């Protein structure tokens, strides 16, 4: 069964950036519902169960550019009383919009905390070692939710 629209696809992957093996593991996604990054999805289109291949994914087809306006300074007092506010620490910001958006703490300087709203990989080119583990049809529930069942 070939990877295509509405197929639930399971992959084993290895993520590299400039030679650094950042992440490894296994996931399943619903194909053709914008759940996986475009580049890696385009590379998976038509593939059979068992196939192994490599994929280079530019930022454009990964997590996009790195907007410098995404880098803002916020007061240290705005953080939870008993939370470690250090570089790499992840939190959430929320306002009247009612939309929680995630951030990574970049630097802490006195009462000024520099945070980054960009995706951690925004601006990077990703290299992938991919193995197509399994390809099955999606259930009605899955199609209804537009996501694979974890």
């Amino acid at each position: 069964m070939k990877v295509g629209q509405d197929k639930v696809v399971t992959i084993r992957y290895t993520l590299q950036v400039e030679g650094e093996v950042l992440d490894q593991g296994e996931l399943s996604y619903l194909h053709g519902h914008r759940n996986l990054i475009p580049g890696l999805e385009e590379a998976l289109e038509g593939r059979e169960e068992g196939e192994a291949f490599q994929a280079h994914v530019p930022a454009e087809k990964a997590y996009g550019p790195h907007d410098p306006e995404g880098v803002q300074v916020v007061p240290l007092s705005a953080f939870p009383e008993d939370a470690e506010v250090v570089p790499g620490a992840q939190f959430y910001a929320q306002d009247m919009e009612g939309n929680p958006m995630p951030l990574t703490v970049v630097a802490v300087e006195g009462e000024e905390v520099t945070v980054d709203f960009n995706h951690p990989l925004a601006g990077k080119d990703l290299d992938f070692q991919v193995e197509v583990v399994k390809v099955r049809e999606a259930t009605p529930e899955e199609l209804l939710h537009g996501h694979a069942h974890p």
Binding site: G70, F79, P80, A93, Q94, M96, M101, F117, N118
Partner: peptide, 15 residues
């Protein structure tokens, strides 16, 4: 994308 906007009342939680 995206910025912070004090023209509301932005807060931060650590879940």
């Amino acid at each position: 994308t995206r910025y912070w906007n004090p023209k509301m009342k932005p807060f931060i939680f650590g879940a």
